[PDB]
């Protein structure tokens, strides 16, 4: 059998019975390429960035200086580490400081319909002690119970320091983890499962440690 905590490490999402087409392809924005090519273009006022669409490289006026292609250019931070998080199994911490708003990592897994996921829950997952299912869009989820990347080890917090964002990238929706606030070296990354995770209808104590803790992962106040 498989070893405890085993999972298949994948490089990008695996489309099972659905593909999360966004219906949109970004075209040329109104940005101007900086003449100093060490300076980023397509910053906060990029019209594609403002609709959570990453630029398309054949049409972006900033070319290699575009900083609105973070997911497709795989611009993950390289300082993440899996560690033993007290009373929360494995967690993920950043070894170096992060800043509010920063892109951290793409969340990967198997893209499945809610129908397929419910089938997998009945047949396999119902008695697991750890769960791995992120929301995505209407009728579909990212299932990282079997396949994914190290983002699957990020724990829930009732006072999170990161969030998920859904972006249109090359015609498909993809999910990135972004910092909500500055974080010093050593910080465990967390996000709010109530906002970003699929309701797997499982009942688990929250050990996030905050005074505002809801007591249950994904629970109400
Ligand atoms: N996905 C992962 S990894 C994961 C891992 C562990 C728990 C949950 C998780 C659990 N729940 C509830 C199940 C019933 N419990 S309960 O304690 O049994 C009792 F008794 F009923 F209160 C209360 C908590 C959730 C509720 C929501 C609500 N969000 C949504 O539905 C989306 C937001 N847009 C709509 C989101 C995630 C969860 C998800
Ligand atoms: C997406 S996995 C996170 C990685 C997991 N800790 C592990 O060891 O592989 C979600 C599971 O981690 C545990 N977990 C996540 N956040 C937690 C928290 N705040 N308190 C206690 N357990 C938590 C729960 O068992 C949950 O089903
Ligand atoms: Zn732009
Ligand atoms: Zn651009
Ligand atoms: Zn909590």
Residue numbers in the entry: 2063 to 2283
What did the authors write?
At the molecular level, ASH1L is a large, ~3000 amino acid protein that contains a catalytic SET domain responsible for the transfer of a methyl group from the S-adenosyl methionine (SAM) cofactor to the lysine substrate. While ASH1L represents an attractive drug target, developing ASH1L inhibitors is challenging, as the catalytic SET domain adapts an inactive conformation with autoinhibitory loop blocking the access to the active site. At the molecular level, ASH1L maintains the H3K36me2 mark, which enables the recruitment of the MLL1 protein complex to chromatin to activate target gene expression in leukemia cells. The crystal structures of ASH1L-inhibitor complexes reveal compound binding to the autoinhibitory loop region in the SET domain.
Thus, we designed two further analogs of AS-6 by introducing 1-(trifluoromethylsulfonyl) piperidine moiety at the indole nitrogen and azetidine or methyl-azetidine rings at position six of the indole, yielding AS-85 (clogP = 3.4, tPSA = 108) and AS-99 (clogP = 4.1, tPSA = 99), respectively. Importantly, both compounds are potent ASH1L inhibitors (IC50 of 0.60 and 0.79 µM for AS-85 and AS-99, respectively), and strongly bind to the ASH1L SET domain, with the Kd values of 0.78 and 0.89 µM, respectively, Fig. 4a, b and Supplementary Fig. 5a. To understand how optimized inhibitors bind to ASH1L, we determined the crystal structure of the wild-type ASH1L in complex with AS-85 (1.69 Å resolution) and found well defined electron density of the ligand. Overall, the binding mode of AS-85 is very similar to AS-5, and the common core structure occupies the same site on ASH1L. The piperidine moiety at indole nitrogen fits into a ledge formed by the side chains of E2263, Q2265, and I2278 as well as the backbone of the C-terminal residues G2280 and G2281. The positively charged azetidine ring of AS-85 forms favorable contacts with the helix dipole from the short helical fragment encompassing residues from N2254 to H2258 and a water-mediated hydrogen bond with F2257. In addition, the amide group in the linker extending from the indole ring at position six is involved in a hydrogen bond with the backbone carbonyl of N2256 and a water-mediated hydrogen bond with N2261. An intriguing feature of this class of ASH1L inhibitors is the presence of a thioamide group, which forms a unique network of interactions, including the chalcogen bond between the sulfur in thioamide and the backbone carbonyl of H2193. Structural studies demonstrate that the inhibitors we developed bind to a site adjacent to the autoinhibitory loop in the SET domain, possibly stabilizing the conformation in this region and allosterically blocking the enzymatic activity of ASH1L.
